[PDB]
Every structure is written in structure tokens, then in C-alpha cells.
């Protein structure tokens, strides 16, 4: 397995002009490994009982040596997982990477779905108000089929049984992640990476000396920033309301998911029909999947240059990003008619600019 | 990867496993070329970066103006107008 | 003495590549000159076409031996 190590991470030859925007994959992998370490060492002291989970998490912070550090590293590294993934996705929307990296793009989408599931399962385990009512909402959202929801819950309502199986599932999924990562990289190195210029070039250079050092530099920056936020708390990434014990008969008066879930939340606020809600997610994900075979949707021969530099027309990916940010903004606010109106405007933009990527 | 007519080798010595990726991506040097490199122990390596700073920065910033900033300005506009609409609503609906 | 490379890439002259590598030496009159004359001999030489009576794969010279056993060919 050493010979493979050398073939793929030492003698592998890249293009000279790979700048930082091509370093974020490595970064998400590293946040995965790190999150796994802190996960396992958190599991050694966590209690999976509805009667006492909350106090179990508080015991780590209050009465255990370095107890606070692992919880906070685990909490904060999640945000960086998602931030790095979104940068990593947008880079390849910008470049039209999926033109020839077909199966890599598919694998990517599967990994993103895995990550969403993993995060949301994690989000229930500390067992506060937000955890209980979030679980209630998302389980009610997948109700269309009889008996599936009491079965997956384990029970007529969110329960200790639900906590136990969420804990086991959150244990298992990351490692399935890892396996799919190996699959991802297989498809990638089958083809070879693209340039920022989107041309084919013979001016290649080996990995170990030049690109490995850039990977290391960015890694230093990321470790830095994680520790900064973890130790000092600069930003209010997580809302305070998960600090309150659960009550099964009273909701919290103000509700804000974790930031990486706000856009979705915005949709659930503005579309009238609940099924329309769910279908928007399904449709957008199907549209992203459809990009894998964009070469077939037209008989003009395709190029990777999108000529977005100096261009007054901008590009659909940029409009997508700004629409998504606008949806995050509206996600965060209270339900009111005007917020809903601009919500619907932004939602139409978000859907249309995704549909239109296929129309070259 | 490379087309089959590019990855056809002139030599016949067996490719060692640790060089797999190297020869899957073989390409011909049509016309040949000459190259020169200096050992990094005999080069300045932080002065060349700052010496060419202004040119690089002009290029990068020029390239991103229209595509990233102008839609940004429009979006910022929209947020300000939304705030206006809300702060007027909240009085119309609930203040006598 | 400058540490640099000067490579002439050419794929229209057959399968064989030629190379030379150099280090900084010592003057004629240096005390260590003799030792240098010896080190040149410790590394020695090899030809695949014409070999004397010792097979390269069993030679006493370890550099020749390592070269002749690479990938068995």
C-alpha cells in the first residue's frame, strides 16, 4: 500500500497553475478525520438516555479534565466542514468541472447527502428544546407514507428509543463516508483535475514539493481559525435555545436552526403546500444530479471556459450564490408578510437559476 | 488520462507501480523544447513576490469587478429596501 | 559553481536518454585530491553490451549490482 501512496500522493503530476481554490477538498477530508477523533473521545463519556443525556453533556464540561475542549472543538469543526464543502462545490459549478468529471460529481452529491444526515443526527444528541422540536419537525416532514414515521421514531413520539438509535446511526455514518471518499478519489484520479483556465496543457509538475506545501499552509490557517473560534467565541454560530431542557408540551418562542440549515428552513416558511415544500428539495437535488451528463443535452461541442471575467452578464452560479445567501437572511427572520414576499422572489430566483444551467 | 496516441511510449522498460499515474498522463513534446531552472538555495524568494505585486493585484481585481461586485451591490440594495418595507409595515399594522 | 539544470527535450531521436550530473570538486594541489581519485573508482562504471567475465548481478561493486537487478531486467 506504500507503492500506491507514492503513486498518488508523491509522484502524481498536476498543472502548474493550481491555486488555493483547489485545496479545499483536502481540507474537508481533514475536518472529517479531526471530527472522527473528537467524536470517539466524546462517546466514552456520553449517556444515551432521555432522562439524563443533557446532564451527561454538562458533566464533561464541568467535572472532567480538558472536558470542555473536545466538546467545543467538535461543535465548531462542523461549521468548517460545511463552509469548506460549499466553497468546494461552488468552485466546480464555476469551472463546469462536471463536464468530464461525471462520476466524481455524482459521488460528491452522495457525500453531501451523507454529511447532511450525519450532522442532523448529531444535532439531536445533546437533547435540548431545539433538538426535540427539530426532530419532531423533520420526522413530521417525511410523513406521507403510513407507519414509516412511528417505525423510524420507534414510538408514537420522539423518545429515548429514538435517542438510542440516533446515537448508533451517528456513530456509524461517518465511516461509510470514508468508504465513499475512497470511491470519490478513484473516479477523480481516473480522469485528472481541471485547470482554472480550462485548457489542456503539458506544463505539468509533480505534487510532493510544490502542491503539498500549499496544502500544508492552508491546513495551518484552518487549524488556527478553528482554535480561535473554539477558545474565544467570536461568532454566535449556534443559538442559545438548545441550552434549555426539553418540554414536550411547550415550544420555544423563537426558532433558528444551525446556519447550514437556514436556507432549507426559509423554503418551508414561504411555500404554501407542504408537499410542494418537500418537492422543491427533491427537484433541486435532481437538477444538480442532471448536470453529470450535460454533454448529451445539446449537439454543440462543449468548452469549460465560461468567460465570467470582466463580464457584465456575470454567471448563473453567482446569481445562485447570492440567492442562497438572501435565503439564509430570510431564514433567520420572523414570519411576516414582507419577509415572505421577498422570500418568494428569492426562491423563484434560486429555482430558475438552477434549472437554467442545462441550456447552453 | 490521455488519448492512446499520446500515451504510447518509445521505451520498452516495464513501468514500475509507483510511477503509474506518471505514464497514464504521458504527452508528446511536439517540436521539442529547452528549459532552465535554478536551485532554490540560489534564488531570492520573497522579493520576487512583492516586486510583481501591483501587476498581479490589478489583474485579479480587474477580473472580478463586474461578475462579483455589481450583483453584490444589487443584492445589498434589495436588503435595504426589504428593511424599509418591514419597518413601514410594522407601524401600519399595529400603531394607531 | 551554480546549481542548475539545462534540459533539451526531444522525442524524435529514438528511445534513449543521455544525462550527466556534477558536483563541485577540488583543485590539483588539494590534499584530498587522491581521495577524490579513489571515490571515482568506488562508484565505477558499467556497460550492458560488454561485461568482462563477472555478471553484473553478482559483481562486488554494489552500485552495479543494484542497477543490474532493478525490476529483474
Amino acid at each position: 500500500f506504500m507503492s500506491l501512496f507514492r503513486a498518488h500522493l508523491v509522484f502524481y503530476r498536476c498543472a502548474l497553475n493550481l491555486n488555493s481554490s483547489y485545496n479545499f477538498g483536502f481540507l474537508v477530508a481533514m475536518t472529517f478525520v479531526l471530527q472522527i477523533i473528537t467524536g470517539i473521545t466524546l462517546a466514552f463519556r456520553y449517556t444515551s438516555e432521555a432522562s439524563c443525556a443533557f446532564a451527561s453533556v454538562q458533566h464533561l464540561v464541568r467535572e472532567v479534565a480538558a472536558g470542555w475542549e473536545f466538546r467545543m472543538l467538535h461543535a465548531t469543526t462542523a461549521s468548517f466542514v460545511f463552509l469548506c464543502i460549499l466553497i468546494h462545490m461552488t468552485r466546480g459549478l464555476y469551472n463546469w468541472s462536471y463536464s468530464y468529471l461525471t462520476t466524481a460529481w455524482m459521488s460528491g452529491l452522495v457525500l453531501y447527502l451523507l454529511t447532511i444526515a450525519t450532522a442532523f443526527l448529531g444535532y439531536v444528541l445533546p437533547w435540548g428544546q431545539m433538538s426535540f422540536w427539530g426532530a419532531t419537525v423533520i420526522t413530521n416532514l417525511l410523513s406521507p407514507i403510513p407507519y414509516l414515521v412511528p417505525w423510524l421514531l420507534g414510538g408514537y413520539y420522539v423518545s429515548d428509543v429514538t435517542l438510542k438509535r440516533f446515537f448508533v446511526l451517528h456513530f456509524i455514518l461517518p465511516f461509510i463516508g470514508c468508504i465513499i471518499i475512497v470511491l470519490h478519489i478513484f473516479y477523480l484520479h481516473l480522469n485528472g483535475s481541471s485547470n482554472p483556465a480550462g485548457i489542456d496543457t503539458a506544463l505539468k509538475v509533480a505534487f510532493y514539493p510544490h502542491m503539498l506545501m500549499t496544502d500544508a499552509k492552508c491546513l495551518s490557517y484552518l487549524i488556527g481559525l478553528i482554535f480561535l473560534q473554539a477558545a474565544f467565541g467570536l461568532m454566535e454560530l449556534s443559538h442559545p435555545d438548545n441550552s434549555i431542557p426539553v418540554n414536550r408540551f411547550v415550544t420555544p418562542l423563537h426558532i433558528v436552526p444551525e446556519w447550514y440549515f437556514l436556507a432549507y428552513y426559509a423554503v418551508l416558511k414561504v411555500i404554501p403546500s407542504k408537499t410542494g415544500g418537500l418537492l422543491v428539495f427533491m427537484s433541486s437535488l435532481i437538477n444538480l444530479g442532471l448536470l453529470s451528463e450535460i454533454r448529451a443535452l445539446n449537439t454543440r461541442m462543449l468548452i469549460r471556459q465560461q468567460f465570467m471575467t470582466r463580464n457584465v452578464v456575470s454567471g448563473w452560479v453567482i446569481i445562485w450564490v447570492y440567492s442562497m445567501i438572501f435565503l439564509i437572511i430570510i431564514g433567520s427572520a420572523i414570519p411576516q408578510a414582507t419577509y415572505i414576499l421577498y422570500g418568494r422572489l428569492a426562491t423563484i430566483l434560486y429555482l430558475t437559476t438552477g434549472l437554467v444551467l442545462c441550456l447552453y | 488520462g490521455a488519448p492512446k496516441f499520446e500515451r504510447k511510449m518509445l521505451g520498452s522498460y516495464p513501468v514500475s507501480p509507483e510511477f503509474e499515474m506518471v505514464w497514464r498522463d504521458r504527452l508528446t513534446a511536439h517540436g521539442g523544447y529547452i528549459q532552465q531552472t535554478i536551485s532554490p538555495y540560489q534564488l531570492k524568494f520573497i522579493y520576487p513576490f512583492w516586486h510583481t505585486f501591483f501587476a498581479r493585484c490589478w489583474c485579479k481585481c480587474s477580473a472580478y469587478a463586474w461578475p462579483w461586485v455589481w450583483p453584490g451591490l444589487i443584492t445589498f440594495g434589495l436588503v435595504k429596501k426589504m428593511n424599509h418595507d418591514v419597518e413601514e409595515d410594522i407601524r401600519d399594522h399595529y400603531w394607531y | 559553481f551554480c546549481g542548475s539544470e539545462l534540459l533539451h527535450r526531444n522525442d524524435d531521436m529514438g528511445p534513449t536518454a543521455h544525462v550527466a550530473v556534477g558536483f563541485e570538486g577540488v583543485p590539483w594541489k588539494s590534499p584530498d585530491a587522491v581521495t577524490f581519485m579513489l571515490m571515482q573508482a568506488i562508484v565505477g562504471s558499467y556497460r550492458k553490451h560488454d561485461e568482462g567475465i563477472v555478471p553484473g548481478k553478482v559483481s562486488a561493486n554494489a552500485t552495479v549490482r543494484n542497477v543490474c537487478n532493478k525490476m529483474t531486467v
Binding site: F1, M2, S3, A7, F186, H189, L190 | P17, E20, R24 | -
Partner: peptide, 18 residues
């Protein structure tokens, strides 16, 4: 073991046919 799995693509090969 540390030199297992010599290839990731292709058809492999055998030492006796070099």
C-alpha cells in the same frame, strides 16, 4: 504486505512475463 496491491487501474500483469 506493505507492497501489496501494485495497481489501481489497468489489467495488472505477472513478474514472470517481464
Amino acid at each position: 504486505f506493505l507492497v501489496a496491491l501494485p495497481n489501481l487501474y489497468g489489467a495488472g500483469g505477472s513478474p514472470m512475463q517481464a
